[PDB]
Amino acid sequence: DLEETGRVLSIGDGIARVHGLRNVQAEEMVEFSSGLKGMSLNLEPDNVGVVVFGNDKLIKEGDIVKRTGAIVDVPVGEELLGRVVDALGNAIDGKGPIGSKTRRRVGLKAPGIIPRISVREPMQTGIKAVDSLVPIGRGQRELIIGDRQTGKTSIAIDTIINQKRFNDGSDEKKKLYCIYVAIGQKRSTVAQLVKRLTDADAMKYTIVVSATASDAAPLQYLAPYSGCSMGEYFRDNGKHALIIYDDLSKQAVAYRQMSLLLRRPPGREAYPGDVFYLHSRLLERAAKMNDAFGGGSLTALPVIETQAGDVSAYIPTNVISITDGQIFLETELFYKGIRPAINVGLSVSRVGSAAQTRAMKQVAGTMKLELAQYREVAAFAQFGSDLDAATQQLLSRGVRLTELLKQGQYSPMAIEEQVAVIYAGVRGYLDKLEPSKITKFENAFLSHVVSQHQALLGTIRADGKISEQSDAKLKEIVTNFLAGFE
Amino acid sequence: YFRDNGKHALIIYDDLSKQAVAYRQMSLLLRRPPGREAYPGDVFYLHSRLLERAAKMNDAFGGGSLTALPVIETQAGDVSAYIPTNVISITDGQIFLETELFYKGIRPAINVGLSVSRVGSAAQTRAM
Amino acid sequence: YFRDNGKHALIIYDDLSKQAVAYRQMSLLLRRPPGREAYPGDVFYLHSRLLERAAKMNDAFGGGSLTALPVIETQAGDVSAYIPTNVISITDGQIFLETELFYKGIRPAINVGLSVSRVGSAAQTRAM
Amino acid sequence: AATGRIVAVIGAVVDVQFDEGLPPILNALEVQGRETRLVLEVAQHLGESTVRTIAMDGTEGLVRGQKVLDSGAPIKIPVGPETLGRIMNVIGEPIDERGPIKTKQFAPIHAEAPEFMEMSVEQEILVTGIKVVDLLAPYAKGGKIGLFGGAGVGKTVLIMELINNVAKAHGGYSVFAGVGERTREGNDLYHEMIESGVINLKDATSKVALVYGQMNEPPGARARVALTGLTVAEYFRDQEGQDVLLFIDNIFRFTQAGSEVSALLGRIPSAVGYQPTLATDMGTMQERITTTKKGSITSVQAIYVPADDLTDPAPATTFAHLDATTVLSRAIAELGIYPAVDPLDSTSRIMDPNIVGSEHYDVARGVQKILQDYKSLQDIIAILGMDELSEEDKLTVSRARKIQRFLSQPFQVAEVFTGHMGKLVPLKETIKGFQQILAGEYDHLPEQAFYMVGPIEEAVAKADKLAEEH
Amino acid sequence: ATGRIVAVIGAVVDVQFDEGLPPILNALEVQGRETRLVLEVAQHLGESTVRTIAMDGTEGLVRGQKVLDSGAPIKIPVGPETLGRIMNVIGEPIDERGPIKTKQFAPIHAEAPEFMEMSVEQEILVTGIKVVDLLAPYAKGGKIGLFGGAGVGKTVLIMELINNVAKAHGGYSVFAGVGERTREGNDLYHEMIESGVINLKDATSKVALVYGQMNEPPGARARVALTGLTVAEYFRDQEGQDVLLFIDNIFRFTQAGSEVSALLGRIPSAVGYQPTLATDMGTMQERITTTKKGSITSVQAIYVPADDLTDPAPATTFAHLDATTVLSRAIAELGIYPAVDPLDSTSRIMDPNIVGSEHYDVARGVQKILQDYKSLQDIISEEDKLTVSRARKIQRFLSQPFQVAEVFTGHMGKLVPLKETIKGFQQILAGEYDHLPEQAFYMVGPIEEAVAKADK
Amino acid sequence: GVGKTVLIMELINNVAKAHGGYSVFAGVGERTREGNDLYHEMIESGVINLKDATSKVALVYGQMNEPPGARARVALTGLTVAEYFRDQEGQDVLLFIDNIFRFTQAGSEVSALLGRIPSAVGYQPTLATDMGTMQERITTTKKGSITSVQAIYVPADDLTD
Amino acid sequence: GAGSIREAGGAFGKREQAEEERYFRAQSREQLAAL
Amino acid sequence: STTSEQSARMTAMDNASKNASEMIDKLTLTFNRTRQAVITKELIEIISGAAAL
Numbered sequence A: 001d002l003e004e005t006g007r008v009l010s011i012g013d014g015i016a017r018v019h020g021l022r023n024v025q026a027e028e029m030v031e032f033s034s035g036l037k038g039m040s041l042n043l044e045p046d047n048v049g050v051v052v053f054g055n056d057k058l059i060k061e062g063d064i065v066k067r068t069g070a071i072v073d074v075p076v077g078e079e080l081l082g083r084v085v086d087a088l089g090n091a092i093d094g095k096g097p098i099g100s101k102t103r104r105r106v107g108l109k110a111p112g113i114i115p116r117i118s119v120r121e122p123m124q125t126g127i128k129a130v131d132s133l134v135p136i137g138r139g140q141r142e143l144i145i146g147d148r149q150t151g152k153t154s155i156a157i158d159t160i161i162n163q164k165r166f167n168d169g170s171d172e173k174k175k176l177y178c179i180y181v182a183i184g185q186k187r188s189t190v191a192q193l194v195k196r197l198t199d200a201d202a203m204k205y206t207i208v209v210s211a212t213a214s215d216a217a218p219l220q221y222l223a224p225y226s227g228c229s230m231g232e233y234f235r236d237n238g239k240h241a242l243i244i245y246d247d248l249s250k251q252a253v254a255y256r257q258m259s260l261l262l263r264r265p266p267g268r269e270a271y272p273g274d275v276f277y278l279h280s281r282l283l284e285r286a287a288k289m290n291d292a293f294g295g296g297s298l299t300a301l302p303v304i305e306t307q308a309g310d311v312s313a314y315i316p317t318n319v320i321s322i323t324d325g326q327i328f329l330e331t332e333l334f335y336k337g338i339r340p341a342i343n344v345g346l347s348v349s350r351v352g353s354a355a356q357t358r359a360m361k362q363v364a365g366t367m368k369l370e371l372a373q374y375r376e377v378a379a380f381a382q383f384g385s386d387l388d389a390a391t392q393q394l395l396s397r398g399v400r401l402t403e404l405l406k407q408g409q410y411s412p413m414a415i416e417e418q419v420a421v422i423y424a425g426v427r428g429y430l431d432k433l434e435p436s437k438i439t440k441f442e443n444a445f446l447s448h449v450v451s452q453h454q455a456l457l458g459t460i461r462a463d464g465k466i467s468e469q470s471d472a473k474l475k476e477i478v479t480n481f482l483a484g485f486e
Numbered sequence B, C: 001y002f003r004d005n006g007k008h009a010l011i012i013y014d015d016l017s018k019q020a021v022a023y024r025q026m027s028l029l030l031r032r033p034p035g036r037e038a039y040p041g042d043v044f045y046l047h048s049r050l051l052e053r054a055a056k057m058n059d060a061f062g063g064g065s066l067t068a069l070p071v072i073e074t075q076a077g078d079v080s081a082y083i084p085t086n087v088i089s090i091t092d093g094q095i096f097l098e099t100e101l102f103y104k105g106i107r108p109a110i111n112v113g114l115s116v117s118r119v120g121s122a123a124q125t126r127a128m
Numbered sequence D: 001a002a003t004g005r006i007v008a009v010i011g012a013v014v015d016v017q018f019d020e021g022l023p024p025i026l027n028a029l030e031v032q033g034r035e036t037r038l039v040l041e042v043a044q045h046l047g048e049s050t051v052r053t054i055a056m057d058g059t060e061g062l063v064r065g066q067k068v069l070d071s072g073a074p075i076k077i078p079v080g081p082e083t084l085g086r087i088m089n090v091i092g093e094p095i096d097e098r099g100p101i102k103t104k105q106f107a108p109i110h111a112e113a114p115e116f117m118e119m120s121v122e123q124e125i126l127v128t129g130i131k132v133v134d135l136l137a138p139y140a141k142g143g144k145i146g147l148f149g150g151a152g153v154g155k156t157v158l159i160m161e162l163i164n165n166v167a168k169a170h171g172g173y174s175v176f177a178g179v180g181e182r183t184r185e186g187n188d189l190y191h192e193m194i195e196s197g198v199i200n201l202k203d204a205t206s207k208v209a210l211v212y213g214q215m216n217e218p219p220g221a222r223a224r225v226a227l228t229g230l231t232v233a234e235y236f237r238d239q240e241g242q243d244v245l246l247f248i249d250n251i252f253r254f255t256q257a258g259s260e261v262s263a264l265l266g267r268i269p270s271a272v273g274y275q276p277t278l279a280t281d282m283g284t285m286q287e288r289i290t291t292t293k294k295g296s297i298t299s300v301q302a303i304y305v306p307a308d309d310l311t312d313p314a315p316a317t318t319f320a321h322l323d324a325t326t327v328l329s330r331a332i333a334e335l336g337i338y339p340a341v342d343p344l345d346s347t348s349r350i351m352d353p354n355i356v357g358s359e360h361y362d363v364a365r366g367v368q369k370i371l372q373d374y375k376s377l378q379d380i381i382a383i384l385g386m387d388e389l390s391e392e393d394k395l396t397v398s399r400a401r402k403i404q405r406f407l408s409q410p411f412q413v414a415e416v417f418t419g420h421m422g423k424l425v426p427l428k429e430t431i432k433g434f435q436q437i438l439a440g441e442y443d444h445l446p447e448q449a450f451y452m453v454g455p456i457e458e459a460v461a462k463a464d465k466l467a468e469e470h
Numbered sequence E: 001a002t003g004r005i006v007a008v009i010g011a012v013v014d015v016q017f018d019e020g021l022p023p024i025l026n027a028l029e030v031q032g033r034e035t036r037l038v039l040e041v042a043q044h045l046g047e048s049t050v051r052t053i054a055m056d057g058t059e060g061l062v063r064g065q066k067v068l069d070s071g072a073p074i075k076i077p078v079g080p081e082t083l084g085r086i087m088n089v090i091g092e093p094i095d096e097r098g099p100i101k102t103k104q105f106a107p108i109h110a111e112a113p114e115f116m117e118m119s120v121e122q123e124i125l126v127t128g129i130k131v132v133d134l135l136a137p138y139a140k141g142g143k144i145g146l147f148g149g150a151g152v153g154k155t156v157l158i159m160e161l162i163n164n165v166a167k168a169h170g171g172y173s174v175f176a177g178v179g180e181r182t183r184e185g186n187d188l189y190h191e192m193i194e195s196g197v198i199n200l201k202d203a204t205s206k207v208a209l210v211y212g213q214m215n216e217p218p219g220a221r222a223r224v225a226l227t228g229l230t231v232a233e234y235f236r237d238q239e240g241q242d243v244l245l246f247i248d249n250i251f252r253f254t255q256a257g258s259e260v261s262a263l264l265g266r267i268p269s270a271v272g273y274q275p276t277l278a279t280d281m282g283t284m285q286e287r288i289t290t291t292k293k294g295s296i297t298s299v300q301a302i303y304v305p306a307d308d309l310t311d312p313a314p315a316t317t318f319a320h321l322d323a324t325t326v327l328s329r330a331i332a333e334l335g336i337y338p339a340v341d342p343l344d345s346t347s348r349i350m351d352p353n354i355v356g357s358e359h360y361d362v363a364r365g366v367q368k369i370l371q372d373y374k375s376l377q378d379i380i381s382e383e384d385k386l387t388v389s390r391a392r393k394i395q396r397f398l399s400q401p402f403q404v405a406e407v408f409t410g411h412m413g414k415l416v417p418l419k420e421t422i423k424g425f426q427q428i429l430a431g432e433y434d435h436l437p438e439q440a441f442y443m444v445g446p447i448e449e450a451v452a453k454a455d456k
Numbered sequence F: 001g002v003g004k005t006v007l008i009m010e011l012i013n014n015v016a017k018a019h020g021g022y023s024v025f026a027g028v029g030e031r032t033r034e035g036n037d038l039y040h041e042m043i044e045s046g047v048i049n050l051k052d053a054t055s056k057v058a059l060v061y062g063q064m065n066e067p068p069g070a071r072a073r074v075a076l077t078g079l080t081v082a083e084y085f086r087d088q089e090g091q092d093v094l095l096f097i098d099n100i101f102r103f104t105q106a107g108s109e110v111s112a113l114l115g116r117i118p119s120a121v122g123y124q125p126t127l128a129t130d131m132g133t134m135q136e137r138i139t140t141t142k143k144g145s146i147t148s149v150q151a152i153y154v155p156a157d158d159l160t161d
Numbered sequence G: 001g002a003g004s005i006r007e008a009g010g011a012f013g014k015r016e017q018a019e020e021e022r023y024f025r026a027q028s029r030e031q032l033a034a035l
Numbered sequence H: 001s002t003t004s005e006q007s008a009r010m011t012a013m014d015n016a017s018k019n020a021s022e023m024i025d026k027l028t029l030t031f032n033r034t035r036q037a038v039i040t041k042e043l044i045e046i047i048s049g050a051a052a053l
């Protein structure tokens, strides 16, 4: 055990200027004499700038720093499912060590141009608004952006809970393993989230990487890359993963702290010059591999908190430029009763219909066109009774489809029931009903179709489309329940 | 001196914006790093350690008092600027003077909707 | 060379906004304190020392002249920016070219209500 | 232990050179040859056996070469039931002129946050007796609350009303931490706690410990006094299993204090002029204010919002550390409605139908929705006027104004500001009254009948009196 | 000459040469690496040290690691063997089809053509697209800002421009994906393979792809535009062609320059941009011009930050644009393809002294009739209906079927000459076709096809 | 271009012409042709008399072609002439300064080179103290009166500069 | 921007407040007298 | 009288919307200028604070 070492020249704010270590590599993991870890970020002619994976009160001037000879890596594998880990993969839920066999570097490069195939398979969230108007595909990077307390973590948690129907089935092609990286959150918030995922039985296929608010800035910086490596394990082995960075604003803040303390040249909002490089090299790793590479995929759902809805800030601009679309949430829509508070006018999915089943495509094209016309003429509400019959019909259909998109928390819907509900909506079978009942109807009708009409739902789920027999049967079911509805 | 000898004093700082400017010059020339608007990091301390010395003593200390009336000049009505927010968060109430009220004939141009007295009717004669 | 040898020269600077940008680049690369819009402090002197050399000499010095037509490009028609107001404070009047008049077909798109010539009116021919 | 010498004094920052035995970071050093006790907290090792430190008191009269002694530990404050009814400063000295604080154990003010396996998920509503809080953003037992507001919107009055109600209804050793606030308010709270019996100068059954570092303190004291109060509350939580209340006013000052030394510690400023270490400092402080499996800490923190921004890095960073934020608005205080709680900006993580019941949740959502609709209609009202509104919309505006007034409430501590009597509305009464206003059961009563009343029966009685008068 | 790494800070590397310092902008190969790591020299720091920006990741670099001076700037293979391939900023093939076997290499840093090599007269680059050729033509050697992003057929327009220039003028095209998303880069590669522009089997490819992805350090994304420009410069100077150069996005070029300048420790200018913003854009854009041998015409996708045209990046780009092509979604919803907004697309050469009095008069008449039609749509007399009818016909006639879409729609691809475009719109304006139905002008080539379609 | 010079020349025409005492005009960082105009206009109006000692106006000039040091000290030169006419003769002096802002501006241009940390808007940290040191000399005493008309340029029409 | 006109203050927000108060003091008068 | 107020009101609201759109354009120009200036001012503050070390 003969190791190459150096002396701590100085220590402060979690940065150790270290003498010696002549052969340390850039981004190499070193170990301090107190047992703490560090990463060599600055290789300078006379010193090395080490960022400390912990509390700097244990490091003193003169302490011995050993090399490890390895870039930072994390354990990967299926042994991590159901575990809560830190940024370095150490178990923090007290359930014993992670019995993993494989380790993967956190800073590997993304797949190139050729190993990819187009994003074509749907990633079902269970939220009607997302699955119909902002469809997400496997291999996509869809941003969840919004102000504080607007319902972003709820969208991520619904997407995680929804994959239980696929992970309990036998179709191995449709199974999605979830990963929830929590950066800069309270430990009690993460405990509430873990309890919510356990109650929904969603932990057995979920990893929770936890770099919380009291963890050092390097750990919050590194947690998204650790989670991304844990998901790349599945993406490389023919399986499909989903990863939620909650959120990337806090990782940017941690990286800015590390950079400013390392005396790196600050830029706009004091962020370093390579914060775009940071988020882009994190997000380009979510890919869809072709069959020659196993056909696996990794879907990224980064989260961004905007201040007062300012999407022209630095980090929102960067991550909006990087991703393949955005799900925008509004607090005004939240308090109007529209929940999930998705802004359909601003939300976008540049993958689009290529990430939808044919049935959802059928009903969702119509729903999108109708909601667009409604948004065009929606200012004329408060005067609707004094325009054409066409304008009043646009307003009526628009509010019906709007109430059709509201959804409860922690209750993701299967794609067949979403299609049935949107069918009842965009076919006109809710125009005679008044708005204050739509939601109620949407519930009762649902129960009906779940109880006595498993054949139609199963046939839609198996076909992926609404064939003419399916169309007619849906027609009769809807009209019968509507005629017999209170 | 008066406050600690059973007497009541009243002091007016006219004004603290110019003291903050003098302190900013003095600090920038000592090569101390600049903060917001080049003001030093501890300009809030500069005004708070001063305005906290205006106090009302109990009868074991003479019962004297020192009342402070700091003055702050805002630029184009920006009470959201650094020094005005500092001194607004320090004091026990503000008398807001506005130009629109000044020219409408309201003199003294006290904006009552914005003027606060955190002491209130406790500092007032019963008839008034 | 012509102004000082009894002849008359005209000179167009097309344009001084780009010279100001180049000088701001040179100043920021020399690590000099940026001011408004990150321009150096002496971005006014930059243009003033240049446009002061356009002069009319009396007959004891030859009688030659040098007429200057500095060009300035505004952004969205904002002539209250930094460099536009500098050059307005330097020159003897301006010719405002408007985009609304250019798009409507009025060409030259001179805004005759805002274009002024302070010292040229005494030079107009009698018939004009 | 080890002895060094002062080599530099710049503002509240002092450099000390140790020949033997460099002290770890966060140690407390005592300056030798001073009348009062001056403590320097180590912040950086500068190399060449020199440490940079932050002064806990004034640095005037310090001389280069003056002797500095290493204590071997961080600032250790006395902890125990003897601190109840006492006032201590940042370094644990008694500042109430009542003599020393003879505890039997001392705790360092720097400790590690509780682990992840020590967290408790129990969410139980804490009824405060305030209408808007309990209705729209109710507080939970053992949760972190946070009260946001600009200068003069009512953070102190609301935190004092919460003290009054809960702490006098509580049996668990409250702890108040004045962090960079007015000393006048500290004396006021001390005496209104003595006269309330919560602090007992004899027969020591006091149930509140006070920790105070006010605006006139240096940046170091104002940055560490929150940790001192936190450590008192932490002893009460861990080593006694009690359920502690932790009031902090104001927590923004903590953050601000850091800024006032940041550049003097040699750090490039971040955005809006804040220390590059803002989020992590706030994290390591706030992650210790938490309920564990060993005890419970309900914490109410007044959070100053500079210039009514709410996007400033300090409040925006604080938002993610709280369970039930109460945001006070100046636009609401200027209407005359108190408390100035913004109904469309306050939040609670227990505003969940599976927690507060479907009736509570439905009433809260209906109130918020009608207020948002009133907001949307006010534009039409500005353009068209009121007489050209639909009748459904005139009804919406009437019920919305009535709900606005009914969210107001007279406080027991504001009896001088209003002349009114204090009202403590129970939870079921709040839900019932707001349900009845939303249902239309009081369309015939005026809107000034709901201004500054308790339960809805008081609104009815006030309307009857207002009519009987004219 | 061989030096050694003395400092590694992010994507900045200080390399010390004991002898023979490399000039600024030279390429240095870091030795002992699994993959090729190139460093571009940016400063001479003194004491035989140079500061360099890295073209790839710098993880695992060791102080004292050997570095080899190449004696030239980044050199890329130029020639016809680049057509149909994908290369990165350092000229490496990234399509997994083997080495790019050319006979000549060219440095990506070259000077703009001298003042005496410039073409003294402006002329039109005929694209065969009716709305472009008529209302906002492309100057041969100019810069065209392509506005409008997703869902308006920008890729179909790019491929149609490539194909039309290859067929009509006989010139090839380069596509520089600056800051390209890897997903959309793969999508575009395969869209070009399907539409026949790229051919993986024979040597009849029409475009050379140069990709610098989003996950590459700022230096790579800053120099990828110069790499594509060097390929195009070969095709112009050595083959004597009329090259097309597509740059997507140009705002990402500006952003990469900004990040590189911030990493080198330069004081940011206004709104955070590099102090050398205008000269970066200038030394890039001045190479896209008409020489006495050929020309390079550049279509550059424009992104406007915060939708503010006075932002330094758009305002610096707009100083060089000779034309503007706005793809609008409102026009695409009307089924009109290409979705070129006919009233928002502008051109500096739309001037009777350059395009001719007849072309200019026809274009101004078309623009006026479209403005009149929208003013009439505002409220909805005797001839207002006539203008409505003629403007409907003009709208329908601006649409056109593209060759690169034949495998989707089935229709044939029309490359309309300029004279035919002028004549057709002249005749429609002069009332020669008020008897044909308005649906007879939809998706046709010349006006003869419109009358033959109305015969049905 | 809003009318500072037209107004100061109208004040010279209205007040300084019929004035009893002396008058000093200091051109600080303005147009040289404006100085030529003012000189020849004061000659052709008889206020400056090139043939005897009947002149009533002194003229100091450091204009916008001068380096920043001259533009920083020329206001002080004009102040000195006016101070002599006030203290040492008890006269009632008129002091016209145009433009006084240039004084401040010139300081900025040297504050960078003097090695001082910049203040807000890139201004010298000594802006207020320099301005006060200059402006307190421009005053009325009980030994003589000075009426001072100063034109103040407002950069980019920003009145909070 | 639902209450944007009265959150901005100014003439259009001060007239809205006055109109609201006028209407509802009228209604509170005609509601109290009917009690 | 109707057909005279229903057209005068139409014209009045048209002119009101025109004036509102003009003011919106002017205010958008001012907003863009102000936000660019704010970004630059914050950058200069950070750079000046970093250059003093």
Ligand SMILES: Nc1ncnc2c1ncn2[C@@H]1O[C@H](COP(=O)(O)OP(=O)(O)OP(=O)(O)O)[C@@H](O)[C@H]1O
Residues within 6 Å of the ligand: A147, A148, A149, A150, A151, A152, A153, A154, A155, A339, A340, A407, A408, A409, D320, D348, D349, D351, D352
């Ligand atoms: N579809 C919904 N229906 C009802 N309530 C919801 C819904 N979605 C979210 N909420 C509620 O809105 C509140 C905020 O949602 P959430 O915490 O998930 O968003 P967030 O952006 O992650 O908040 P934070 O700022 O703390 O990160 C939660 O209390 C949640 O219960």
Ligand SMILES: Nc1ncnc2c1ncn2[C@@H]1O[C@H](COP(=O)(O)OP(=O)(O)O)[C@@H](O)[C@H]1O
Residues within 6 Å of the ligand: B116, B117, B118, B119, B120, D149, D150, D151, D152, D153, D154, D155, D156, D157, D158, D338, D339, D411, D414, D417, D418
């Ligand atoms: N609940 C209230 N009732 C009546 N007046 C109040 C109330 N809250 C605040 N005020 C008024 O607003 C003023 C400011 O109160 P304060 O508690 O000091 O706010 P803050 O702590 O945010 O500075 C008080 O002096 C009081 O006049």
Ligand SMILES: Nc1ncnc2c1ncn2[C@@H]1O[C@H](COP(=O)(O)OP(=O)(O)O)[C@@H](O)[C@H]1O
Residues within 6 Å of the ligand: C089, C116, C118, F001, F002, F003, F004, F005, F006, F007
């Ligand atoms: N009193 C005035 N009457 C008419 N025009 C005026 C008047 N004042 C200014 N102007 C116009 O504004 C222009 C600017 O005048 P000037 O005083 O020289 O500008 P500055 O503010 O830079 O000193 C004048 O050339 C003139 O056209």
Ligand SMILES: [Mg+2]
Residues within 6 Å of the ligand: A152, A153, A154, A246
């Ligand atoms: Mg969340």
Ligand SMILES: [Mg+2]
Residues within 6 Å of the ligand: D155, D156
């Ligand atoms: Mg208070």
Ligand SMILES: [Mg+2]
Residues within 6 Å of the ligand: F004, F005, F030, F098
């Ligand atoms: Mg003038």
